[PDB]
Amino acid sequence: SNIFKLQIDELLEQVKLKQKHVLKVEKFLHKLYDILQEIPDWEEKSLAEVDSFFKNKIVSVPFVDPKPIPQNTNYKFNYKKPDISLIGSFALKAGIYQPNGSSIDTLLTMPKELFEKKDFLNFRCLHKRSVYLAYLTHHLLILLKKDKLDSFLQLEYSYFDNDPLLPILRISCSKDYNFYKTRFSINLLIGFPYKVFEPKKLLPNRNCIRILPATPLYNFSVLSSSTHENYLKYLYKTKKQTESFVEATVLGRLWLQQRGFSSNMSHSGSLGGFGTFEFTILMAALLNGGGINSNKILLHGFSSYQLFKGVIKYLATMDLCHDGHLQFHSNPASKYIDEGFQTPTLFDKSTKVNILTKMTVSSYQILKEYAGETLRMLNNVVQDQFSNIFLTNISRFDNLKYDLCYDVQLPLGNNLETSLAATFGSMERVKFITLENFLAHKITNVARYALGDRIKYIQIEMVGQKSDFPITKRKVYSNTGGNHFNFDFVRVKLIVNPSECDKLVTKGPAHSETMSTEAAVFKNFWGIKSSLRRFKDGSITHCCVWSTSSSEPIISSIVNFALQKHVSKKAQISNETIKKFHNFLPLPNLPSSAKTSVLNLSSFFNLKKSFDDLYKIIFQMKLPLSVKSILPVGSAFRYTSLCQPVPFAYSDPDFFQDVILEFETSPKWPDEITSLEKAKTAFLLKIQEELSANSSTYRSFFSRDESIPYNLEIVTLNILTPEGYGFKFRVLTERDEILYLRAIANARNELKPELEATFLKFTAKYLASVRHTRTLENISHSYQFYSPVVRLFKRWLDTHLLLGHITDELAELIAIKPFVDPAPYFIPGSLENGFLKVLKFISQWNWKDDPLILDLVKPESERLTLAQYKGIQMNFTNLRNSDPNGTHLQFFVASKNDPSGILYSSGIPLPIATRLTALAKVAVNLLQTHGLNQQTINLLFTPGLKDYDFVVDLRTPIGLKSSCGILSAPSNFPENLNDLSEKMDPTYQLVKYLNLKYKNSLILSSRKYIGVNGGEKGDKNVITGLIKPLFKGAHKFRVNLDCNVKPVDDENVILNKEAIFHEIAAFGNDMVINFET
């Protein structure tokens, strides 16, 4: 806890505003208050005159739609001196330093005599406020000119909290009274006197716009306008009583922008409404009670951490929108009522205002989700979560924050089509003051209802919505809007639910004698798309049908059809970004591949069933030693192979799946390792013999393995199943491990580091490989979108020639980080969201100082507890102590399976490690500079190939796509298994050997999959090299240079680049075509 407390204090002092810029502002707006008093009074006027008073003035009054007309504006207008006051966070002294800039809210209370008791009807009082604001702006401008301050002051109108009904004046300073350096700007809020209108008449259920329907938004707008100072004094006493109010406020302040939460309007579409005030007001309600027994949930002696924790706990578990609502007394213990108003509500009986009116139903659940998931991290003790909770902005990119995004282009966008304007209709102005608010609610309801359980959260955002307009104009002007609609287009942003996202059918109400109301809305909403259909269980229900596609999800089809039918037949729905990523995933050569969804693992399952058939044959067979167990460890068994398995597609490098066979423990094993394996091969030899005899339909052949260095006797059996799949078999022996432990002990002290490396890769293939597949296969079920993303990440590595040095496991452990550790984000449910998160993590990963450790567990045991946790960092510190620069090891990837942390990240050259991080940052920077689109995505997935010193072009004799199982084909294995060689791509093997010969000087790379990244025909592959700095320049020759060099002087040599090329060309033979140096 002490670490967290000090982290808070460090965080505060970083964000504390500088007191000098404070003293500068009070110098200004104190003088501004003198200007306010200078303004003269005014007499009673009608709308007809004031239009003539403002007809020629530069100022124009900001009437709110519907503007007063001469008939209904018989009310008169007058101005009188206001009661100048300062409110907001600045009044409470709870503000912080903001690079974008902060705001000072000063309130002007119009005198009570300017109102009649019934002026809260039909926008009566508001129109008085608008002219009052306008009359101020006229006199402020001339008095601003008189005092010569206008040179560095810019004045513009704006809407308070993006509320169209509350225009306000905006005072900002451009580059003695100049406060531009302060990054502060004053807001002029024209509020009403307290208790001008009976608050009972202004309840959310009541109405105040005659046409009856309730008007919660307008009722709050007027009533909130009359209640500003009252909540100031309410917050003031709480700050006095509890010492940690301001500290808790600023922690809540910071948490909000990281999640993109503000006090602005949300019914318009923007995520927000919850600011400091809604945070701080909820503090006081809970400090005064909050429980179902009116018991205090927060005690005034609580520290900053405890005050913040309870509310993050409060918002997380108590529901304030659908079932339950909280009431408190500003002027009386706060009580949690079980009844709910179906909208977020924090009622105040003293003031009769619901502060949570600005909260949309959709945003509240999103808010509740963030509170709950932070509470889990707040309770977390194993890992420090201070940076994630506070020092990480999740709102920078919508795609990273939100799984799917659809942008909808409404028709005729210098006004909306007559039909769409007609749909808004008179009935909804009273309910929803602006069309932007109405259309968002229309889009949410149809989109929410159409998708249903397929999604978790839905957000509708009005792209290009402005809130500030010049004083010369009455209402904000959008270039597309034409003073009609303040937006460019709407974007439908979704949090999809992986469990039921790809469900082929949307279940509806059951059949009955009399069509029920739920059935009524069900048939009407989907129309022809609706149908009554029966299932195997015998249930009769109304249902609609969708068709899966390998390019798009079912959601794109639903949102398109649902939105066109209800909102507008002319709208255009397009999400091409997700389409590109789906296409970049290879399309297998299986029946109905195009119709198959990206979440379907049928291809992997058919491989397992074929293995099961061979799994039975091997056991019933009689051997000198009984078979203990057969453990498949291949990539396809863990749903990670770059291309899905295809029958007889043996050009796929992943065609042969590793399988570990272990026989029963015996004491007759040879104690000599070369004798040990020749006994191992003698097993597989017998397995081949009776397998050939008893089951002739299976074909088999042996091959050598050289993955373990110096262990040149390993022989593996490759079994070609009749189904069209290949399996590769190797022995595991209990003696094998200890012999390697014997191997390290006897070695000379100089050779021991080399031998342990041999042991490291042995356990990576034999011992730890079993554990990696077991855990990953189980965890993959919970993370439905882990399967698609990891291939696309590996596909991305192959395009940039990184898979050759990166073991497949390391990519998997990297790709799973956003899921077991999704904070501060949510678990991805989309291919684009999951992939970009992997790229983001690499961009911000400091592998020199920050270790990567994961809990390979299903979502909330095997979780890392504190003792095992601390052990792993202690390993990282010890390794970094010996390797501070990280030259020997770069990525420290550890887990329960790998506590050492060096198992799957050893042997990678430093250039490749920096290249991996280099591409990720440029990828993130590319997304920053240019938003996600088709051109960027192609730019992400294409290789530069220029920075490489020399580039070698290869072309295979035949196209390898069709034998690789990729749809732009063999149907049986060759009669002679030697013919298999003719249809392989060896370039992955070629590069490996040349690395060994030229490790000291060159780093060659090649594309491991040629069928996927080999152009149209999948026959083109490239070898790219790099000359190290030392041998790039001239060197004095020595027997230990260990390089191919040419003499220049008697005692100097230089790299012989051309001789290297000829060796590559001869070794490539016909495959090599062109050389670029």
Binding site: K848, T914, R915, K921, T942, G944, K1028
Partner: peptide, 14 residues
């Protein structure tokens, strides 16, 4: 165009 990054061999990029 292409996603091209200067090769860093001193780990200076991090």
């Amino acid at each position: 165009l292409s996603l091209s990054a200067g090769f860093d061999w001193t780990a200076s990029i991090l």
